[PDB]
Design a binder for this molecule. Structure first.
Ligand SMILES: CCOP(=O)(OCC)[C@@H](CS)CCCc1ccccc1
Ligand SMILES: [Zn+2]
Ligand SMILES: [Zn+2]
Ligand SMILES: [Zn+2]
Length: 232
């Protein structure tokens, strides 16, 4: 049902309807000689769409917009990137050219600039302290604290009980840590506990990469992070 790495050539994007007015988008990218799947989110709000994250590069993000037009047919008017890595902001220039208003926290914008990654134009205020939440159209944005990166945001869709954990949450199939070069390993389990405490009602949990599940993904991620922490 849910699209996998095997079934998506790099350059194509799949949409997966989760609920009324809520989709994930799934793309793949080559990196260091392997191929990785990647998720984002699409959320309807009236007669327009809110996009969560790019499809990991310009080419994929072009295909994303085309696939949205084909399968949904409503305009993307705002986008939020949930941290500064290229699987979240790579393609922001494509979005902007298409008239999308692109957003990220000041921390994400600052880190993207440092990294040399594309910089969302608008700033999300009210998210700089762990446990901060703000409304953004049909979703709530939440800063759980440092985890996969110091700037990582999570996204909740109240009407659908959909929790988008982004890359701070791992799919169950991943039993080893991925890119933790920018991670706060020491804080990551505590940040995951904040997510659990704030969104215990979540029914559909979407990781940044791979298969969705339920709130168990949180404990799973903590397990994997703690096991990496204990590198021997
Ligand atoms: C292997 C390179 O991972 P990235 O640093 O890609 C550069 C943008 C990471 C940013 S979150 C995305 C890929 C994470 C992943 C690792 C292993 C399996 C599935 C996804
Ligand atoms: Zn990342
Ligand atoms: Zn990622
Ligand atoms: Zn596990």
């Amino acid at each position: 049902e849910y699209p996998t790495v095997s079934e998506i050539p790099v350059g194509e994007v799949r949409l997966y309807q989760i609920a009324d007015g809520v989709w994930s988008h799934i793309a793949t990218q080559s990196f260091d000689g392997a191929v990785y799947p990647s998720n984002g989110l699409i959320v309807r709000d009236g007669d327009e769409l809110l996009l969560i994250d790019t499809a990991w590069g310009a080419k994929n993000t072009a295909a994303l917009l085309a696939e949205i037009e084909k399968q949904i047919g409503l305009p993307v008017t705002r986008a939020v990137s949930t941290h500064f890595h290229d699987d979240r902001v790579g393609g922001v220039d494509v979005l902007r050219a298409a008239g999308v208003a692109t957003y990220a926290s000041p921390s994400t914008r600052r880190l993207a600039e440092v990294e040399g990654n594309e910089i969302p134009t608008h700033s999300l205020e009210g998210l700089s302290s762990s446990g901060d939440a703000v409304r953004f159209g049909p979703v709530e944005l939440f800063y759980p604290g440092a985890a996969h990166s110091t700037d990582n945001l999570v996204v909740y869709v109240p009407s659908a009980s959909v929790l988008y954990g982004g890359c701070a949450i791992y799919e169950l199939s991943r039993t080893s840590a991925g890119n933790v070069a920018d991670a706060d390993l020491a804080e990551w389990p505590t940040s995951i506990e904040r997510i659990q405490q704030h969104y215990p009602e979540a029914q559909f949990v979407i990781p940044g990469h791979g298969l969705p599940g339920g709130l168990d993904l949180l404990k799973h991620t903590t397990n994997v992070v703690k096991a990496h922490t204990n590198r021997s």
